[PDB]
Amino acid sequence: GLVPRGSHMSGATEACLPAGQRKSGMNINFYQYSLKDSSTYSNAAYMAYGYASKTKLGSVGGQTDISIDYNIPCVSSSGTFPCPQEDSYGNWGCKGMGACSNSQGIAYWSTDLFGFYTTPTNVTLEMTGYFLPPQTGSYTFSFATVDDSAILSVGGSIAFECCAQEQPPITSTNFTINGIKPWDGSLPDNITGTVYMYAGYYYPLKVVYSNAVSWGTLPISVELPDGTTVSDNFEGYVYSFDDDLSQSNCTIPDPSIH
Ligand SMILES: OC[C@H]1O[C@@H](O)[C@@H](O)[C@@H](O)[C@@H]1O
Numbered sequence: 001g002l003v004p005r006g007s008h009m010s011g012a013t014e015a016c017l018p019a020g021q022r023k024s025g026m027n028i029n030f031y032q033y034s035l036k037d038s039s040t041y042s043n044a045a046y047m048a049y050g051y052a053s054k055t056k057l058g059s060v061g062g063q064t065d066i067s068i069d070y071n072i073p074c075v076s077s078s079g080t081f082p083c084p085q086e087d088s089y090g091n092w093g094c095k096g097m098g099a100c101s102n103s104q105g106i107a108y109w110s111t112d113l114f115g116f117y118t119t120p121t122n123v124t125l126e127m128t129g130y131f132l133p134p135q136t137g138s139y140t141f142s143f144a145t146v147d148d149s150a151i152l153s154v155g156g157s158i159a160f161e162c163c164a165q166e167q168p169p170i171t172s173t174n175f176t177i178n179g180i181k182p183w184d185g186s187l188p189d190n191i192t193g194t195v196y197m198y199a200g201y202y203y204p205l206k207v208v209y210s211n212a213v214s215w216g217t218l219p220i221s222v223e224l225p226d227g228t229t230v231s232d233n234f235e236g237y238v239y240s241f242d243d244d245l246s247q248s249n250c251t252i253p254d255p256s257i258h
């Protein structure tokens with residue numbers, strides 16, 4: 001045939017072609033989350049959108065290194081140093097530091113998350129931007145682990161609306177990766193999700209992440225169509241655009257036929 005037939009049953013992921021000035025990296029918004037609240041983040045509506053009904057603490061833009069690896073302090077005999085969780089032991093010490101005099105269960109303030117001074121022990125944050133595939137094909141996004149709760153969403157009308165990156169969150173719960181902390185706190189069923197993408201279109205991307213206490217972890221990766229993996233540093237793949245609600249042609253409801 002002259003033209004491709006298109007993905008079946010309108011199944012292509014919606015993408016975007018924003019016409020404005022592209023910015024490298026994602027925007028990170030931070031919102032209040034209560035220390036040791038082990039229920040709010042179990043919820044889908046909260047992780048999709050309800051987080052933004054909490055106080056907004058601040059934001060930072062232009063972030064290309066997006067994994068989280070927050071370690072609480074150990075107030076040790078030799079000073080205060082961050083403790084990798086796997087090195088913690090007893091009640092409690094940190095291997096190579098001896099016993100720690102401080103509590104695991106209080107809030108701690110740090111710039112570890114994106115340079116923004118907040119409480120990484122207890123916070124929710126929303127990463128938004130557009131993923132630019134260099135290759136047409138299947139992309140597999142993954143979280144290596146999740147501590148405490150996270151989702152990843154890809155696509156127009158799923159992550160956010162085309163050319164409307166800065167708007168309040170949309171209500172879609174059609175997550176690409178559902179990493180929500182289960183009520184009965186095992187691991188989530190699946191912390192990887194696949195999207196078929198067409199090169200050169202901008203795909204809305206949203207990550208929402210919550211920590212309730214102590215350590216926080218979210219190692220983010222994507223496997224490209226060519227089989228290579230990009231981990232943590234997404235420079236060259238993620239971008240931001242200021243809203244332009246007036247750009248009529250911004251949404252591409254089916255890239256395969258566009
Ligand atoms: O923790 C989130 C991000 O914080 C930034 O300031 C850098 O340290 C990144 O390497 C890290 O991925």
Ligand SMILES: OC[C@H]1O[C@H](O)[C@@H](O)[C@@H](O)[C@@H]1O
Pocket residue numbers: 147148212213214215216
């Ligand atoms: O699961 C509740 C909790 O368990 C541990 O205390 C640590 O792994 C925390 O980071 C985690 O939030």
Ligand SMILES: [Ca+2]
Pocket residue numbers: 156157161
């Ligand atoms: Ca829409």
Ligand SMILES: [Ca+2]
Pocket residue numbers: 147148211212213214215216
């Ligand atoms: Ca935690």
Ligand SMILES: [Cl-]
Pocket residue numbers: 093094095096097098099
């Ligand atoms: Cl030790």
Ligand code: NA
Pocket residue numbers: 069070071084085215217
């Ligand atoms: Na860690």
Ligand code: NA
Pocket residue numbers: 072073074080081082083
């Ligand atoms: Na520290």
